[PDB]
PDB file of C-alpha atoms (C1' of nucleotides) in Angstrom:
ATOM      1  CA  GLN A1439     179.306 181.553 -61.499  1.00 11.21           C
ATOM      2  CA  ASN A1440     175.490 181.458 -61.628  1.00 12.05           C
ATOM      3  CA  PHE A1441     174.661 184.764 -59.958  1.00  9.88           C
ATOM      4  CA  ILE A1442     171.308 186.563 -60.067  1.00 12.18           C
ATOM      5  CA  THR A1443     171.655 190.241 -60.974  1.00 10.65           C
ATOM      6  CA  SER A1444     168.249 191.696 -61.872  1.00 11.48           C
ATOM      7  CA  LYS A1445     166.726 193.578 -58.954  1.00 10.36           C
ATOM      8  CA  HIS A1446     163.280 192.404 -60.067  1.00  9.95           C
ATOM      9  CA  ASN A1447     164.427 188.792 -59.671  1.00 11.02           C
ATOM     10  CA  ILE A1448     165.906 189.667 -56.269  1.00 13.95           C
ATOM     11  CA  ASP A1449     162.616 191.196 -55.102  1.00 14.63           C
ATOM     12  CA  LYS A1450     160.573 188.293 -56.479  1.00 16.41           C
ATOM     13  CA  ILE A1451     162.845 185.821 -54.676  1.00 17.74           C
ATOM     14  CA  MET A1452     162.630 187.814 -51.433  1.00 17.53           C
ATOM     15  CA  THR A1453     158.835 187.615 -51.761  1.00 13.01           C
ATOM     16  CA  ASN A1454     159.156 184.106 -50.291  1.00 15.89           C
ATOM     17  CA  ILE A1455     161.929 185.030 -47.817  1.00 13.72           C
ATOM     18  CA  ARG A1456     160.390 185.566 -44.372  1.00 11.56           C
ATOM     19  CA  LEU A1457     162.990 187.209 -42.151  1.00  9.33           C
ATOM     20  CA  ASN A1458     162.149 189.446 -39.199  1.00 11.80           C
ATOM     21  CA  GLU A1459     163.972 192.429 -37.726  1.00 10.78           C
ATOM     22  CA  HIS A1460     164.907 190.792 -34.399  1.00 11.43           C
ATOM     23  CA  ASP A1461     166.758 187.891 -36.057  1.00 11.72           C
ATOM     24  CA  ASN A1462     170.487 187.449 -36.555  1.00 14.10           C
ATOM     25  CA  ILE A1463     171.121 185.808 -39.930  1.00 14.80           C
ATOM     26  CA  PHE A1464     174.142 183.662 -40.756  1.00 16.28           C
ATOM     27  CA  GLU A1465     175.202 182.506 -44.210  1.00 17.34           C
ATOM     28  CA  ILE A1466     176.987 180.303 -46.861  1.00 18.86           C
ATOM     29  CA  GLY A1467     177.737 182.700 -49.742  1.00 20.11           C
ATOM     30  CA  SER A1468     177.524 186.434 -50.414  1.00 19.03           C
ATOM     31  CA  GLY A1469     177.907 186.320 -54.190  1.00 16.81           C
ATOM     32  CA  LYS A1470     178.231 189.671 -55.926  1.00 19.18           C
ATOM     33  CA  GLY A1471     176.283 191.321 -53.107  1.00 21.08           C
ATOM     34  CA  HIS A1472     172.958 191.329 -54.949  1.00 20.29           C
ATOM     35  CA  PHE A1473     171.104 189.656 -52.077  1.00 23.59           C
ATOM     36  CA  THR A1474     173.162 190.504 -48.979  1.00 26.20           C
ATOM     37  CA  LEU A1475     172.684 194.186 -49.835  1.00 25.94           C
ATOM     38  CA  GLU A1476     168.965 193.760 -49.156  1.00 24.47           C
ATOM     39  CA  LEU A1477     169.642 191.280 -46.339  1.00 28.72           C
ATOM     40  CA  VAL A1478     171.579 193.789 -44.228  1.00 29.33           C
ATOM     41  CA  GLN A1479     168.560 196.113 -44.149  1.00 28.00           C
ATOM     42  CA  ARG A1480     165.984 193.342 -43.624  1.00 30.70           C
ATOM     43  CA  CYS A1481     167.469 191.831 -40.501  1.00 29.11           C
ATOM     44  CA  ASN A1482     169.356 192.968 -37.415  1.00 29.32           C
ATOM     45  CA  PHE A1483     172.766 191.337 -37.829  1.00 27.43           C
ATOM     46  CA  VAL A1484     174.461 189.701 -40.820  1.00 27.88           C
ATOM     47  CA  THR A1485     177.395 187.282 -40.757  1.00 28.37           C
ATOM     48  CA  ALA A1486     178.843 187.354 -44.278  1.00 29.87           C
ATOM     49  CA  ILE A1487     181.015 184.302 -44.967  1.00 29.67           C
ATOM     50  CA  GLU A1488     182.625 184.104 -48.412  1.00 30.05           C
ATOM     51  CA  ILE A1489     185.398 181.863 -49.723  1.00 25.72           C
ATOM     52  CA  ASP A1490     186.542 184.381 -52.365  1.00 24.74           C
ATOM     53  CA  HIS A1491     188.667 187.260 -51.102  1.00 22.23           C
ATOM     54  CA  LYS A1492     187.638 189.520 -54.015  1.00 21.57           C
ATOM     55  CA  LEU A1493     184.011 188.731 -53.344  1.00 22.18           C
ATOM     56  CA  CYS A1494     184.640 189.531 -49.677  1.00 21.82           C
ATOM     57  CA  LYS A1495     186.071 192.949 -50.564  1.00 19.70           C
ATOM     58  CA  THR A1496     183.326 193.726 -53.080  1.00 20.19           C
ATOM     59  CA  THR A1497     180.736 192.841 -50.436  1.00 19.39           C
ATOM     60  CA  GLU A1498     182.647 195.054 -47.995  1.00 18.40           C
ATOM     61  CA  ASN A1499     182.682 198.160 -50.184  1.00 15.56           C
ATOM     62  CA  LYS A1500     179.148 197.375 -51.365  1.00 17.28           C
ATOM     63  CA  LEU A1501     178.037 197.346 -47.703  1.00 13.90           C
ATOM     64  CA  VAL A1502     180.071 200.264 -46.339  1.00 16.83           C
ATOM     65  CA  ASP A1503     176.753 202.101 -45.877  1.00 12.23           C
ATOM     66  CA  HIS A1504     175.824 199.657 -43.098  1.00  8.55           C
ATOM     67  CA  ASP A1505     177.361 198.715 -39.764  1.00  7.85           C
ATOM     68  CA  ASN A1506     174.831 196.030 -38.748  1.00  6.10           C
ATOM     69  CA  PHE A1507     176.925 193.197 -40.152  1.00  5.05           C
ATOM     70  CA  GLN A1508     180.357 191.610 -40.032  1.00  5.73           C
ATOM     71  CA  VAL A1509     182.354 189.410 -42.396  1.00  3.42           C
ATOM     72  CA  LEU A1510     184.242 186.301 -41.316  1.00  3.00           C
ATOM     73  CA  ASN A1511     185.744 183.535 -43.467  1.00  2.64           C
ATOM     74  CA  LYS A1512     185.968 180.168 -41.671  1.00  4.80           C
ATOM     75  CA  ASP A1513     185.672 177.440 -44.387  1.00  4.13           C
ATOM     76  CA  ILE A1514     181.948 176.662 -43.949  1.00  5.27           C
ATOM     77  CA  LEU A1515     183.179 173.088 -43.480  1.00  6.86           C
ATOM     78  CA  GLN A1516     184.870 174.206 -40.239  1.00  4.27           C
ATOM     79  CA  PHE A1517     182.951 177.300 -39.188  1.00  3.20           C
ATOM     80  CA  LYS A1518     180.843 177.035 -35.950  1.00  4.85           C
ATOM     81  CA  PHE A1519     177.786 178.803 -34.229  1.00  6.68           C
ATOM     82  CA  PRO A1520     176.247 180.573 -31.060  1.00  6.06           C
ATOM     83  CA  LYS A1521     174.811 177.497 -29.371  1.00  6.04           C
ATOM     84  CA  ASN A1522     173.276 180.098 -27.190  1.00 10.34           C
ATOM     85  CA  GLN A1523     171.731 182.390 -29.811  1.00  4.64           C
ATOM     86  CA  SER A1524     168.363 182.321 -31.607  1.00  4.86           C
ATOM     87  CA  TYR A1525     169.048 182.924 -35.310  1.00  4.98           C
ATOM     88  CA  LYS A1526     167.148 182.462 -38.549  1.00  6.89           C
ATOM     89  CA  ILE A1527     170.163 181.427 -40.671  1.00  4.38           C
ATOM     90  CA  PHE A1528     170.007 182.444 -44.240  1.00  5.71           C
ATOM     91  CA  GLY A1529     172.557 180.931 -46.667  1.00  5.13           C
ATOM     92  CA  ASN A1530     173.274 180.534 -50.422  1.00  4.69           C
ATOM     93  CA  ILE A1531     173.838 177.808 -53.098  1.00  4.65           C
ATOM     94  CA  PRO A1532     176.629 175.154 -52.839  1.00  7.09           C
ATOM     95  CA  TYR A1533     178.159 172.570 -55.185  1.00  8.78           C
ATOM     96  CA  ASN A1534     176.781 169.375 -53.585  1.00  8.17           C
ATOM     97  CA  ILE A1535     178.381 169.282 -50.048  1.00  8.04           C
ATOM     98  CA  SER A1536     177.005 165.728 -49.489  1.00  9.51           C
ATOM     99  CA  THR A1537     175.394 165.938 -46.029  1.00 11.93           C
ATOM    100  CA  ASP A1538     178.275 168.335 -45.400  1.00 12.45           C
ATOM    101  CA  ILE A1539     176.461 171.663 -45.052  1.00  8.44           C
ATOM    102  CA  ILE A1540     173.306 169.624 -44.466  1.00  8.04           C
ATOM    103  CA  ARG A1541     174.909 168.290 -41.291  1.00  9.48           C
ATOM    104  CA  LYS A1542     176.018 171.845 -40.514  1.00  7.73           C
ATOM    105  CA  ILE A1543     172.371 172.937 -40.626  1.00  8.87           C
ATOM    106  CA  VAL A1544     170.561 169.935 -39.107  1.00 10.77           C
ATOM    107  CA  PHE A1545     173.278 168.147 -37.123  1.00  9.10           C
ATOM    108  CA  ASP A1546     175.910 170.797 -36.315  1.00  5.66           C
ATOM    109  CA  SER A1547     173.586 173.679 -35.436  1.00  5.57           C
ATOM    110  CA  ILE A1548     170.285 174.619 -33.817  1.00  5.81           C
ATOM    111  CA  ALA A1549     169.121 176.544 -36.882  1.00  2.21           C
ATOM    112  CA  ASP A1550     165.396 177.205 -36.455  1.00  3.47           C
ATOM    113  CA  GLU A1551     164.565 178.396 -39.997  1.00  7.71           C
ATOM    114  CA  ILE A1552     166.661 177.684 -43.089  1.00  9.31           C
ATOM    115  CA  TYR A1553     166.258 178.741 -46.732  1.00  9.29           C
ATOM    116  CA  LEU A1554     168.082 177.129 -49.670  1.00  8.35           C
ATOM    117  CA  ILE A1555     168.136 177.477 -53.440  1.00  8.05           C
ATOM    118  CA  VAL A1556     168.871 174.024 -54.868  1.00  4.01           C
ATOM    119  CA  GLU A1557     168.781 172.068 -58.141  1.00  4.16           C
ATOM    120  CA  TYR A1558     165.338 170.646 -59.070  1.00  5.31           C
ATOM    121  CA  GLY A1559     166.754 167.124 -58.859  1.00  2.90           C
ATOM    122  CA  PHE A1560     167.727 167.600 -55.222  1.00  2.00           C
ATOM    123  CA  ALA A1561     164.366 169.304 -54.725  1.00  2.00           C
ATOM    124  CA  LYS A1562     162.608 166.108 -55.833  1.00  2.00           C
ATOM    125  CA  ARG A1563     165.314 163.675 -54.654  1.00  2.00           C
ATOM    126  CA  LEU A1564     165.884 164.053 -50.856  1.00  2.00           C
ATOM    127  CA  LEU A1565     162.078 164.612 -50.651  1.00  2.00           C
ATOM    128  CA  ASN A1566     161.429 160.941 -51.552  1.00  2.00           C
ATOM    129  CA  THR A1567     161.615 158.516 -48.636  1.00  2.00           C
ATOM    130  CA  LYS A1568     163.806 156.033 -50.545  1.00  2.00           C
ATOM    131  CA  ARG A1569     167.056 157.738 -49.430  1.00  2.00           C
ATOM    132  CA  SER A1570     168.496 157.397 -45.934  1.00  2.00           C
ATOM    133  CA  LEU A1571     169.862 160.930 -45.695  1.00  2.00           C
ATOM    134  CA  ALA A1572     166.240 161.974 -45.980  1.00  2.00           C
ATOM    135  CA  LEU A1573     165.430 159.776 -42.994  1.00  2.00           C
ATOM    136  CA  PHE A1574     168.111 161.349 -40.786  1.00  2.00           C
ATOM    137  CA  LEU A1575     166.939 164.716 -42.110  1.00  2.00           C
ATOM    138  CA  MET A1576     163.264 164.077 -41.288  1.00  2.00           C
ATOM    139  CA  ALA A1577     164.362 162.802 -37.870  1.00  2.00           C
ATOM    140  CA  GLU A1578     163.933 166.293 -36.359  1.00  2.00           C
ATOM    141  CA  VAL A1579     163.343 168.878 -39.120  1.00  2.00           C
ATOM    142  CA  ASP A1580     160.702 169.345 -41.807  1.00  2.00           C
ATOM    143  CA  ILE A1581     160.987 170.556 -45.413  1.00  2.00           C
ATOM    144  CA  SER A1582     158.591 172.690 -47.429  1.00  2.00           C
ATOM    145  CA  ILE A1583     159.108 173.656 -51.071  1.00  2.00           C
ATOM    146  CA  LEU A1584     158.328 177.366 -51.277  1.00  2.00           C
ATOM    147  CA  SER A1585     158.922 177.960 -54.994  1.00  2.00           C
ATOM    148  CA  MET A1586     160.737 176.793 -58.114  1.00  2.00           C
ATOM    149  CA  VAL A1587     163.556 179.081 -59.271  1.00  2.00           C
ATOM    150  CA  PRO A1588     163.902 179.565 -63.054  1.00  2.00           C
ATOM    151  CA  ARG A1589     167.310 178.765 -64.500  1.00  2.00           C
ATOM    152  CA  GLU A1590     167.725 182.008 -66.474  1.00  2.00           C
ATOM    153  CA  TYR A1591     167.689 183.836 -63.125  1.00  2.00           C
ATOM    154  CA  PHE A1592     171.412 183.125 -62.698  1.00  2.00           C
ATOM    155  CA  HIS A1593     174.235 184.751 -64.725  1.00  2.00           C
ATOM    156  CA  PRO A1594     176.135 181.834 -66.392  1.00  2.00           C
ATOM    157  CA  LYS A1595     172.634 180.525 -66.953  1.00  2.00           C
ATOM    158  CA  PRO A1596     172.596 176.936 -65.632  1.00  2.00           C
ATOM    159  CA  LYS A1597     171.069 174.010 -67.493  1.00  2.00           C
ATOM    160  CA  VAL A1598     168.556 172.935 -64.820  1.00  2.00           C
ATOM    161  CA  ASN A1599     165.726 174.730 -63.048  1.00  2.00           C
ATOM    162  CA  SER A1600     166.224 175.553 -59.375  1.00  2.00           C
ATOM    163  CA  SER A1601     163.865 175.547 -56.406  1.00  2.00           C
ATOM    164  CA  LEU A1602     163.535 177.235 -53.020  1.00  2.00           C
ATOM    165  CA  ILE A1603     163.266 174.999 -49.955  1.00  2.00           C
ATOM    166  CA  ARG A1604     162.507 175.801 -46.319  1.00  2.00           C
ATOM    167  CA  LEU A1605     163.689 173.899 -43.234  1.00  2.00           C
ATOM    168  CA  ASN A1606     162.033 174.098 -39.779  1.00  2.00           C
ATOM    169  CA  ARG A1607     162.803 171.924 -36.686  1.00  2.00           C
ATOM    170  CA  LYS A1608     160.192 169.509 -35.164  1.00  2.00           C
ATOM    171  CA  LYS A1609     162.238 167.102 -32.945  1.00  2.00           C
ATOM    172  CA  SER A1610     161.555 165.361 -29.551  1.00  2.00           C
ATOM    173  CA  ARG A1611     161.969 161.575 -30.176  1.00  2.00           C
ATOM    174  CA  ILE A1612     164.943 159.109 -30.445  1.00  2.00           C
ATOM    175  CA  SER A1613     166.787 162.111 -28.874  1.00  2.00           C
ATOM    176  CA  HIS A1614     170.044 160.453 -27.659  1.00  2.00           C
ATOM    177  CA  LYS A1615     168.597 157.242 -26.185  1.00  2.00           C
ATOM    178  CA  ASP A1616     167.161 155.303 -29.186  1.00  2.00           C
ATOM    179  CA  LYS A1617     169.271 157.283 -31.718  1.00  2.00           C
ATOM    180  CA  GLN A1618     171.844 154.475 -32.048  1.00  2.00           C
ATOM    181  CA  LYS A1619     168.779 152.294 -32.519  1.00  2.00           C
ATOM    182  CA  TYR A1620     167.242 154.746 -34.985  1.00  2.00           C
ATOM    183  CA  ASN A1621     170.455 154.635 -36.966  1.00  2.00           C
ATOM    184  CA  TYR A1622     170.373 150.861 -36.523  1.00  2.00           C
ATOM    185  CA  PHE A1623     166.807 151.212 -37.791  1.00  2.00           C
ATOM    186  CA  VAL A1624     167.488 153.295 -40.899  1.00  2.00           C
ATOM    187  CA  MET A1625     170.425 151.612 -42.630  1.00  2.00           C
ATOM    188  CA  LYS A1626     168.764 148.202 -42.298  1.00  2.00           C
ATOM    189  CA  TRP A1627     165.569 149.724 -43.716  1.00  2.00           C
ATOM    190  CA  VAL A1628     167.061 151.557 -46.701  1.00  2.00           C
ATOM    191  CA  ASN A1629     169.292 148.583 -47.567  1.00  2.00           C
ATOM    192  CA  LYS A1630     166.192 146.348 -47.414  1.00  2.00           C
ATOM    193  CA  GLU A1631     167.223 143.426 -45.214  1.00  2.00           C
ATOM    194  CA  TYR A1632     164.040 142.674 -43.291  1.00  2.00           C
ATOM    195  CA  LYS A1633     165.145 139.592 -41.350  1.00  2.00           C
ATOM    196  CA  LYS A1634     167.766 141.619 -39.471  1.00  2.00           C
ATOM    197  CA  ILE A1635     164.978 143.793 -38.042  1.00  2.00           C
ATOM    198  CA  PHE A1636     161.838 141.613 -38.205  1.00  2.00           C
ATOM    199  CA  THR A1637     160.924 137.925 -38.248  1.00  2.00           C
ATOM    200  CA  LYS A1638     157.859 137.141 -40.335  1.00  2.00           C
ATOM    201  CA  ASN A1639     155.143 137.486 -37.654  1.00  2.00           C
ATOM    202  CA  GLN A1640     156.410 140.985 -36.950  1.00  2.00           C
ATOM    203  CA  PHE A1641     157.183 141.905 -40.560  1.00  2.00           C
ATOM    204  CA  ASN A1642     153.601 141.141 -41.576  1.00  2.00           C
ATOM    205  CA  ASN A1643     151.611 142.341 -38.567  1.00  2.00           C
ATOM    206  CA  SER A1644     153.532 145.618 -38.285  1.00  2.00           C
ATOM    207  CA  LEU A1645     152.467 146.637 -41.794  1.00  2.00           C
ATOM    208  CA  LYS A1646     148.777 146.081 -41.059  1.00  2.00           C
ATOM    209  CA  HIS A1647     149.223 147.827 -37.719  1.00  2.00           C
ATOM    210  CA  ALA A1648     150.769 150.728 -39.654  1.00  2.00           C
ATOM    211  CA  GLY A1649     148.251 150.473 -42.501  1.00  2.00           C
ATOM    212  CA  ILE A1650     150.773 149.634 -45.227  1.00  2.00           C
ATOM    213  CA  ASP A1651     149.461 148.702 -48.675  1.00  2.00           C
ATOM    214  CA  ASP A1652     152.506 148.900 -50.986  1.00  2.00           C
ATOM    215  CA  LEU A1653     156.158 148.795 -49.947  1.00  2.00           C
ATOM    216  CA  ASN A1654     157.183 150.899 -52.963  1.00  2.00           C
ATOM    217  CA  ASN A1655     155.516 154.113 -51.706  1.00  2.00           C
ATOM    218  CA  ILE A1656     155.950 155.121 -48.058  1.00  2.00           C
ATOM    219  CA  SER A1657     155.095 158.292 -46.153  1.00  2.00           C
ATOM    220  CA  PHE A1658     156.807 159.488 -42.999  1.00  2.00           C
ATOM    221  CA  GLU A1659     154.190 159.239 -40.243  1.00  2.00           C
ATOM    222  CA  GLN A1660     153.471 155.550 -40.855  1.00  2.00           C
ATOM    223  CA  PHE A1661     157.224 154.906 -40.898  1.00  2.00           C
ATOM    224  CA  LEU A1662     157.231 156.562 -37.468  1.00  2.00           C
ATOM    225  CA  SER A1663     154.460 154.209 -36.365  1.00  2.00           C
ATOM    226  CA  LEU A1664     156.462 151.283 -37.766  1.00  2.00           C
ATOM    227  CA  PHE A1665     159.480 152.352 -35.708  1.00  2.00           C
ATOM    228  CA  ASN A1666     157.257 152.630 -32.632  1.00  2.00           C
ATOM    229  CA  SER A1667     156.038 149.084 -33.273  1.00  2.00           C
ATOM    230  CA  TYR A1668     159.663 147.967 -33.605  1.00  2.00           C
ATOM    231  CA  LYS A1669     160.466 149.525 -30.236  1.00  2.00           C
ATOM    232  CA  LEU A1670     157.450 147.778 -28.707  1.00  2.00           C
ATOM    233  CA  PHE A1671     158.513 144.414 -30.143  1.00  2.00           C
ATOM    234  CA  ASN A1672     162.143 144.862 -29.082  1.00  2.00           C
ATOM    235  CA  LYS A1673     161.382 146.277 -25.622  1.00  2.00           C
TER     236      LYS A1673
ATOM    237  C1'   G B 106     148.600 145.965  -9.251  1.00  2.00           C
ATOM    238  C1'   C B 107     147.120 143.189  -3.200  1.00  2.00           C
ATOM    239  C1'   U B 108     149.766 142.375   1.462  1.00  2.00           C
ATOM    240  C1'   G B 109     154.493 143.833   3.843  1.00  2.00           C
ATOM    241  C1'   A B 110     158.861 145.311   6.512  1.00  2.00           C
ATOM    242  C1'   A B 111     163.945 146.068   5.589  1.00  2.00           C
ATOM    243  C1'   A B 112     164.410 151.787   6.945  1.00  2.00           C
ATOM    244  C1'   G B 113     157.132 152.770  13.479  1.00  2.00           C
ATOM    245  C1'   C B 114     155.303 156.581   7.312  1.00  2.00           C
ATOM    246  C1'   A B 115     155.382 154.709   2.685  1.00  2.00           C
ATOM    247  C1'   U B 116     156.245 150.665  -1.373  1.00  2.00           C
ATOM    248  C1'   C B 117     154.400 145.390  -7.418  1.00  2.00           C
ATOM    249  C1'   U B 118     159.357 142.222  -3.907  1.00  2.00           C
ATOM    250  C1'   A B 119     163.466 141.916  -0.426  1.00  2.00           C
ATOM    251  C1'   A B 120     159.034 136.498   1.331  1.00  2.00           C
ATOM    252  C1'   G B 121     154.596 135.384  -1.996  1.00  2.00           C
ATOM    253  C1'   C B 122     150.634 136.073  -5.463  1.00  2.00           C
ATOM    254  C1'   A B 123     147.828 138.183  -9.607  1.00  2.00           C
ATOM    255  C1'   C B 124     148.250 140.120 -14.653  1.00  2.00           C
ATOM    256  C1'   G B 125     150.145 141.541 -19.079  1.00  2.00           C
ATOM    257  C1'   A B 126     153.005 143.074 -25.756  1.00  2.00           C
ATOM    258  C1'   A B 127     149.550 141.984 -33.266  1.00  2.00           C
ATOM    259  C1'   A B 128     156.293 139.018 -29.119  1.00  2.00           C
ATOM    260  C1'   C B 129     158.292 133.322 -28.170  1.00  2.00           C
ATOM    261  C1'   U B 130     157.138 127.874 -27.829  1.00  2.00           C
ATOM    262  C1'   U B 131     153.325 124.382 -28.544  1.00  2.00           C
ATOM    263  C1'   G B 132     148.065 123.586 -30.315  1.00  2.00           C
ATOM    264  C1'   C B 133     147.115 122.904 -37.734  1.00  2.00           C
ATOM    265  C1'   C B 134     149.765 120.416 -42.121  1.00  2.00           C
ATOM    266  C1'   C B 135     154.365 118.288 -44.577  1.00  2.00           C
ATOM    267  C1'   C B 136     159.739 116.295 -44.767  1.00  2.00           C
ATOM    268  C1'   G B 137     162.703 113.866 -41.409  1.00  2.00           C
ATOM    269  C1'   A B 138     167.462 107.835 -37.597  1.00  2.00           C
ATOM    270  C1'   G B 139     173.773 109.436 -43.055  1.00  2.00           C
ATOM    271  C1'   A B 140     170.179 112.399 -35.787  1.00  2.00           C
ATOM    272  C1'   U B 141     178.097 108.291 -38.146  1.00  2.00           C
ATOM    273  C1'   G B 142     174.760 110.290 -30.733  1.00  2.00           C
ATOM    274  C1'   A B 143     173.499 105.960 -37.177  1.00  2.00           C
ATOM    275  C1'   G B 144     167.081 104.716 -32.206  1.00  2.00           C
ATOM    276  C1'   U B 145     162.410 101.164 -31.130  1.00  2.00           C
ATOM    277  C1'   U B 146     158.968  97.082 -32.063  1.00  2.00           C
ATOM    278  C1'   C B 147     156.887  92.432 -34.825  1.00  2.00           C
ATOM    279  C1'   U B 148     157.956  88.151 -37.842  1.00  2.00           C
ATOM    280  C1'   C B 149     161.100  84.618 -40.878  1.00  2.00           C
ATOM    281  C1'   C B 150     165.704  81.647 -42.363  1.00  2.00           C
ATOM    282  C1'   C B 151     170.777  79.067 -41.870  1.00  2.00           C
ATOM    283  C1'   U B 152     172.099  73.467 -36.333  1.00  2.00           C
ATOM    284  C1'   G B 153     177.542  69.046 -42.430  1.00  2.00           C
ATOM    285  C1'   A B 154     182.017  65.898 -43.415  1.00  2.00           C
ATOM    286  C1'   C B 155     187.648  65.317 -44.347  1.00  2.00           C
ATOM    287  C1'   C B 156     192.639  66.583 -44.011  1.00  2.00           C
ATOM    288  C1'   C B 157     194.683  69.496 -41.082  1.00  2.00           C
ATOM    289  C1'   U B 158     194.287  72.992 -37.396  1.00  2.00           C
ATOM    290  C1'   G B 159     195.397  76.440 -43.187  1.00  2.00           C
ATOM    291  C1'   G B 160     193.417  73.380 -47.443  1.00  2.00           C
ATOM    292  C1'   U B 161     188.818  70.312 -49.890  1.00  2.00           C
ATOM    293  C1'   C B 162     183.839  68.198 -50.431  1.00  2.00           C
ATOM    294  C1'   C B 163     178.490  68.408 -49.917  1.00  2.00           C
ATOM    295  C1'   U B 164     174.763  71.911 -49.268  1.00  2.00           C
ATOM    296  C1'   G B 165     172.334  77.429 -51.888  1.00  2.00           C
ATOM    297  C1'   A B 166     167.471  78.596 -47.057  1.00  2.00           C
ATOM    298  C1'   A B 167     164.225  83.535 -46.136  1.00  2.00           C
ATOM    299  C1'   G B 168     164.612  87.064 -49.900  1.00  2.00           C
ATOM    300  C1'   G B 169     166.698  89.971 -53.778  1.00  2.00           C
ATOM    301  C1'   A B 170     168.121  90.750 -58.835  1.00  2.00           C
ATOM    302  C1'   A B 171     167.179  90.205 -64.335  1.00  2.00           C
ATOM    303  C1'   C B 172     162.954  89.406 -68.579  1.00  2.00           C
ATOM    304  C1'   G B 173     157.928  90.210 -70.370  1.00  2.00           C
ATOM    305  C1'   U B 174     152.447  92.545 -70.298  1.00  2.00           C
ATOM    306  C1'   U B 175     151.917  97.524 -68.374  1.00  2.00           C
ATOM    307  C1'   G B 176     149.937 102.145 -65.079  1.00  2.00           C
ATOM    308  C1'   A B 177     145.343 107.824 -63.380  1.00  2.00           C
ATOM    309  C1'   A B 178     154.194 106.434 -61.766  1.00  2.00           C
ATOM    310  C1'   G B 179     157.615 108.879 -65.065  1.00  2.00           C
ATOM    311  C1'   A B 180     163.120 113.195 -68.804  1.00  2.00           C
ATOM    312  C1'   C B 181     166.542 108.711 -67.780  1.00  2.00           C
TER     313        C B 181
END
RNA sequence: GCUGAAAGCAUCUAAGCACGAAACUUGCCCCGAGAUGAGUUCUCCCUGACCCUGGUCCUGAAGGAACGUUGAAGAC
């Protein structure tokens, strides 16, 4: 359900989709072929993965005019990628896949540019720094909200407005060496037990060293500085 | 970081020294010997008889406790 059919809506959505000709594009949903039909002409190669056999066949006979694609169904939960291929990966809209496809795109792949259509709640929640999954997400990639998708766009019109989000990778840090410490850092931070990670000298002087005014509103860069101070204090 | 071989160079170290993190312990203030590992110092008081060899008598110290007038001490 919830498919976008109007070609005007498809064009207006693709207005924010920045895919180039020399990119292979992988997937997470073909739908009724409204978007993959334009996708096969925009980019070089398309990997159409669909969990519905009908939908696979309707994409096939909708795309018989093109040979620059291939279709392959490996439950997204188990599918895998060309660790040695540069690929903008475009995908679709899932149920919730709780850091399930998120891990597939930030932890189980080297995807350089990712586009999602999500529910406005997940657009605003997962952005906030009060959730740990956000912290492991911001560990090496960045998010930008390109646009908000109206709810009537889809065909069993949903109840909640959607939004378009963009993922790009900016890593180089706890790589593999202080990762187990970064994980040790995050869960103790989000669960708010300070004594396990700081005494009181450190807990107070780190905030002023990081320029912290209120603990109820935190940005990312000063959290990074706080983690650097933690590493300095704990060798 | 200085010197220096091990190991004809070299090097903060193997011999030594000098530093050094809004980090640690002290340096500031308070509780604290039920710390059963129960600590230390100063001062004061008790120097009878009998039978028996467990029974009586005489003696009541230093201090504490209780009552009253009460507190800028306090729910009791």
